[PDB]
Ligand SMILES: NC(=O)[C@H](CCC(=O)O)NC(=O)[C@H](CCC(=O)O)NC(=O)CCc1ccc(-c2cc(-c3ccccc3)cs2)cc1
Ligand SMILES: [Ca+2]
């Protein structure tokens with residue numbers, strides 16, 4: 717078992733916005749991604765603009781201040797740290813990707829669901845049906861559902 721948040725009220729802050737999308741769409745993608753996970757756990761997520769935000773959402777490129785540099789367009793899309801203080805919980809998105817609300821470029825919502833999974837303490841799944849599976853694939857956002865493996869995973873951490 718990986719680290720878990722020791723509380724059920726979790727704050728996030730969007731540190732900065734990708735120029736790829738309009739700010740409202742980024743807000744929406746991230747809010748919906750958190751909702752995916754709160755729907756199956758006791759966790760609640762609230763957005764703040766400063767202070768002790770647990771999960772900082774960041775768009776950055778290349779070497780961006782942690783020991784996990786990005787790689788330009790393609791390859792690594794994003795990464796996140798497991799629960800913990802400071803950088804713990806933070807989710808970083810490679811600005812060298814083209815972030816979208818849709819199937820073109822890289823879908824932000826789907827990517828954030830995966831990354832928030834990490835921010836909550838989940839590792840990768842070997843189940844190709846699970847959002848925690850290591851590789852990106854676009855699926856109809858309107859019919860997207862957490863797999864039973866994802867639900868198993870997150871419910872093993874929070875109840
Ligand atoms: N390897 C790839 O296919 C793509 C893009 C390829 C390219 O442009 O270079 N890159 C990535 O996949 C990199 C891997 C980097 C590496 O280890 O090499 N992954 C990462 O950057 C991790 C981030 C991440 C992982 C998974 C997803 C998605 C899962 C689903 C889904 C929905 C329902 C059921 C099952 C799955 C929809 S989307 C989104 C974001
Ligand atoms: Ca943090």
Ligand SMILES: [Ca+2]
Pocket residue numbers: 786787788789790791792793810812813
């Ligand atoms: Ca990349």
Ligand SMILES: [Ca+2]
Pocket residue numbers: 734735736810811812813814815
């Ligand atoms: Ca970009």
Ligand SMILES: [Zn+2]
Pocket residue numbers: 780782784795808
């Ligand atoms: Zn990073």
Ligand SMILES: [Zn+2]
Pocket residue numbers: 830834840850
């Ligand atoms: Zn991952």
